[PDB]
Design a protein around this ligand. Sequence first.
Ligand code: MN
Ligand code: MN
Lengths: 223, 219
Amino acid sequence: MKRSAINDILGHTRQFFSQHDVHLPPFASFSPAQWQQLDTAAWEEVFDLKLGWDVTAFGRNNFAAHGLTLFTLRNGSAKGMPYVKCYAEKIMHVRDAQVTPMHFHWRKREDIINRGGGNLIVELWNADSNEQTADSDITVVIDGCRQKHTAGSQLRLSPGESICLPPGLYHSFWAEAGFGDVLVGEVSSVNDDDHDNHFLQPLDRYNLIDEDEPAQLVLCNEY
Amino acid sequence: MKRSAINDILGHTRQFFSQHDVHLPPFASFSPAQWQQLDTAAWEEVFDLKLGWDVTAFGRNNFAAHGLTLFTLRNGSAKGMPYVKCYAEKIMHVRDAQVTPMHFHWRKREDIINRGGGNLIVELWNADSNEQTADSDITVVIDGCRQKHTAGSQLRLSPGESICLPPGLYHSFWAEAGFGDVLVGEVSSVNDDDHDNHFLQPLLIDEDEPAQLVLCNEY
Ligand SMILES: [Mn+2]
Ligand SMILES: [Mn+2]
């Protein structure tokens, strides 16, 4: 990905958040110059836990078709030390028809929430012992309502609805085509994108960056 | 507390949420009649973990001066079983100058978040061995920025800002007088209001009209 594209994507996502009355912490708007002037001793948590902006095309070449934009608001340490917090939160922008590829988490349990906008479609499979998709029925809880569904079921989350995805459950999601961008919330146990994602297809969680213009903001993986 | 007052409070809070583009799950709007027709097997998590609406005047007679309106969106079991989820979330409405009295949690660690509206003022004290306020410096992290402050400091959270409150840290909060109502988020470890709250000053519904909604303590 080009830095110019990242600058553009983040500008648009910040506007989308503002449109939904979403407010981010002050550090969400820091320029690289402002980051350079901070007391690094007071800000270790942001750096250590990779709080902040995340833009990915999942190692591929078409962000619009496969990609995601996220802001990690709070987190704890993957091991539990030195940041003892068990929980994490993200706020995400899923663009119309934009797909987050099929994956499960080894450890993280997450509630994926449609905070507003379009409709979030979530496709679900159990993983078999070969780490492939299983033919077995899935059991999930959608806003406290427990239910069983066929393997590969595609569930629609309207604004306000959320689903709890236990570790090991394969999931892919997208904003239903035509119904608009979706504001997605994530409230979960600790997030570790370095090690806790298993994609069905072997892919990279982050993209390498072509530095074609000055960065307006700093990504959480480049502190 | 009169049911008419609760109906009005929840009506106003739902409007406030809508004005802030906050969207709640379908169960947030269930009438008592609708709750009666639910499959009790499929919905046990809502009942068991007390998800949903909460309106409190903190046992007193002045909601406007001391009160809070909350919706618990997700939760887990206090002791980790049978609901293993370790996290919880609430969305709350703090009315202008409305105070939540000084309290700490024995177990819950929470991030209190100004999701929008006015400014949230949070007053903080360490707890002593005798469950009184200590005069020791407080160490808190505001949006990943670690800082130390004097005992009893009143810290301002503007929209977007959040503070992590570890267990045992006394806290009281209110919407800064004149800056408007505040939409408050809480993302935390498991919530247990039955046992996990200690108020510094230790803490019935009159059905005068039909209930429009059901509160989380009356399942
Ligand atoms: Mn996931
Ligand atoms: Mn509290």
